[PDB]
């Protein structure tokens, strides 16, 4: 999806590596942890640079865990994370990269948007939609939908997965809904609004079938009830918006199906007893949905184009526009990272000047 | 008359101090929990009844920050207790963090934020309290502005209140004895008194810590 110009590694590869035997820094880290002293973020960055093979990737992830569970984990480096991801791509450890990203809690994997898009593009190139879905979910959990490139990538992956997937489990529905609603809100176009409708429909089904806590627990979703109300609000907003904006017929159909299924078919109470429940509001929800769907078809704002097809159109059209700016920002980040590494060396040598005095004081 | 010095007493004092210092327990140890018995394993004390559901259902501040970059530094964090109690937006800006790395999931530690209570913010970021509690929640990056949108309600309130009957009578009698025949009612100013809700966050900096 992304250009080979995007996949370009030349700058990062040309980064001013300090070359060592991986066992060198491995022994250094072992000694530091035996002493129970704090390893240096710079040290772990250099080890990540010195990664040179698959078993070295394994050693590096082990040391990454050990450092993450260390005082200086507060000093992780985005360039170090990017180097890790690039090395995993290099040595075909993409499975390990995905696992570490999922266990970001245990390891601290917090890649930038550029690295997220890199991993997603690699997965799609491999055709690994099943795992591109997981990467999209991790982006959702991290709340990193700040760029149209990532937004479009996630939308395309999710719609492809929906096309190739029929049976759904409520947790999968939750993940899909969140990962669509976020970039859907980000994208102020017909595709974004249709994605918002789809995600709201899924989340409302989850809310009414499992629980609003089940919806908002650990997700980047609000706890205010009325996801179906927000869906109807989105449809009304589209209807009142300029006609060029359209809602996907597939999104409308799935929303109608959700409403129809809900209508057809220890304990704690989270809602104020005076505020009626979605279970009671369901008939009004269905009536409003029918009226709004009829109004939208009358206005012609409905779009019968396939979700995946329209997303592919948008990807082929606007992606490169995003790619150029993304690569420019990536170069800016690369030179910033080089300057930051220079600063790290400055601090390390300045402190070593004093560290020469440990026994001198004695 | 000269006293016999208590060398062993001094040694015991110093040794106990040093032992406590060198075995100061970790946060992940102190504030652990058993979700079956709802008892803290370190001390074996059972949590109060009213916190059982919250402990079972909700999550801790660091338990959330562990799933964010920079430990979610700069994000707005709200507490479930605050959300339930007050309709106004209450939260911390979470300016700084310091987790207990020794924890397996890094779900304990300390934090510092700018308090916003009932929609009225503060002048500085200070230490959090009840970090170890379970009633915390995260404001999603989106919806942050809408959630924090607070309309300052009219704050005008009573300037003064009547004295208690007997105190009023005493003051009036003293005035009349002094000849101050001014009949204006005696009132007790209350603006000077800064009433605060009982659940308002307290100064964690002055709070103590558990011991083994």
């Amino acid at each position: 999806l992304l250009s080979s110009a995007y996949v370009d590694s030349h700058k990062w590869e040309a980064r001013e590596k300090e070359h060592y035997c991986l066992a060198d820094l491995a022994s250094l880290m072992d000694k530091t942890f035996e002493r129970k002293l704090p390893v240096s973020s710079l040290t772990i960055s250099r080890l990540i640079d010195n990664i040179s093979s698959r078993e070295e990737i394994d050693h590096a992830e082990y040391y990454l865990y050990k450092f993450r569970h260390s005082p200086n984990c507060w000093y992780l480096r985005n360039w170090t994370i990017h180097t890790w991801i690039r090395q995993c791509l290099k040595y075909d450890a993409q499975d390990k990269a995905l696992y570490t990203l999922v266990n970001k809690v245990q390891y601290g994997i917090f890649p930038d948007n550029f690295t997220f898009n890199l991993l997603m593009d690699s997965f799609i190139k491999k055709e690994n939609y099943k795992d591109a879905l997981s990467v999209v979910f991790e982006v959702m959990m991290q709340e990193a939908f700040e760029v149209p490139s990532t937004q479009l990538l996630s939308l395309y992956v999710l719609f492809h997965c929906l096309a190739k997937k029929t049976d759904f489990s409520w947790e999968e529905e939750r993940n899909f809904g969140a990962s669509l609603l976020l970039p859907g809100l980000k994208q102020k176009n017909s595709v974004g609004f249709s994605s918002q409708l789809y995600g709201y429909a899924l989340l409302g089904k989850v809310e009414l079938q499992q629980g609003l806590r089940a919806v908002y627990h650990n997700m980047p979703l609000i706890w205010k009830p009325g996801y179906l109300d927000r869906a109807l609000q989105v449809m009304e907003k589209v209807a009142a918006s300029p006609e060029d904006i359209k809602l996907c017929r597939e999104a409308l159909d799935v929303l109608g199906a959700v409403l129809k299924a809900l209508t057809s078919a220890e304990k704690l109470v989270e809602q104020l007893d005076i505020e009626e429940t979605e279970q009671s509001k369901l008939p009004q929800y269905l009536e409003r949905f029918k009226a709004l769907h009829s109004k939208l078809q009358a206005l012609g704002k409905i779009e019968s184009e396939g979700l995946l097809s329209l997303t592919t159109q948008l990807v082929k059209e606007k992606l490169s526009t995003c790619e150029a700016e993304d690569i420019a920002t990536y170069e800016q980040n690369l030179q910033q990272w080089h300057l930051d590494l220079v600063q790290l060396i400055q601090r390390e040598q300045q402190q070593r000047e004093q560290a020469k005095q440990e026994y001198q004081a004695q | 008359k000269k006293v016999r010095p208590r060398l062993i007493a001094e040694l015991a004092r110093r040794v106990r101090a040093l032992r406590e210092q060198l075995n100061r327990p970790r946060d992940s140890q102190l504030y652990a929990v058993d979700y079956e018995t709802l008892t803290r394993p370190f001390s074996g004390r059972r949590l109060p009844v009213r916190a059982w559901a919250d402990v079972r259902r909700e999550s801790r501040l660091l338990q959330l920050l562990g799933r964010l970059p920079l430990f979610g530094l700069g994000r707005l964090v709200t507490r479930k207790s605050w959300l339930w109690q007050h309709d106004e937006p209450c939260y911390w800006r979470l300016t700084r963090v310091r987790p207990d790395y020794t924890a397996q999931n890094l779900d304990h530690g300390k934090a510092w934020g700018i308090l916003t209570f009932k929609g009225k913010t503060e002048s500085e970021a200070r230490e959090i309290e009840h970090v170890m509690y379970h009633d915390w929640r995260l404001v999603p990056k989106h919806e942050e502005e809408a959630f924090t949108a607070f309309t300052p309600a009219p704050e005008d309130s009573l300037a003064s209140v009547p004295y208690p009957p007997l105190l009023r009578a005493m003051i009036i009698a003293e005035r009349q004895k002094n000849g101050d025949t001014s009949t204006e009612e005696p009132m007790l100013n209350v603006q000077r008194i800064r009433m605060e809700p009982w659940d308002y966050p307290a100064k964690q900096e002055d709070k103590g810590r558990a011991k083994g």
Partner: peptide
Amino acid sequence: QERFLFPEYILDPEPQPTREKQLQELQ
């Protein structure tokens, strides 16, 4: 802001300093 200490050239404390011996000397 940030600082570092070096696991090389270390200066280290001791385990169980045993101030009991120090008082046994004192008394």
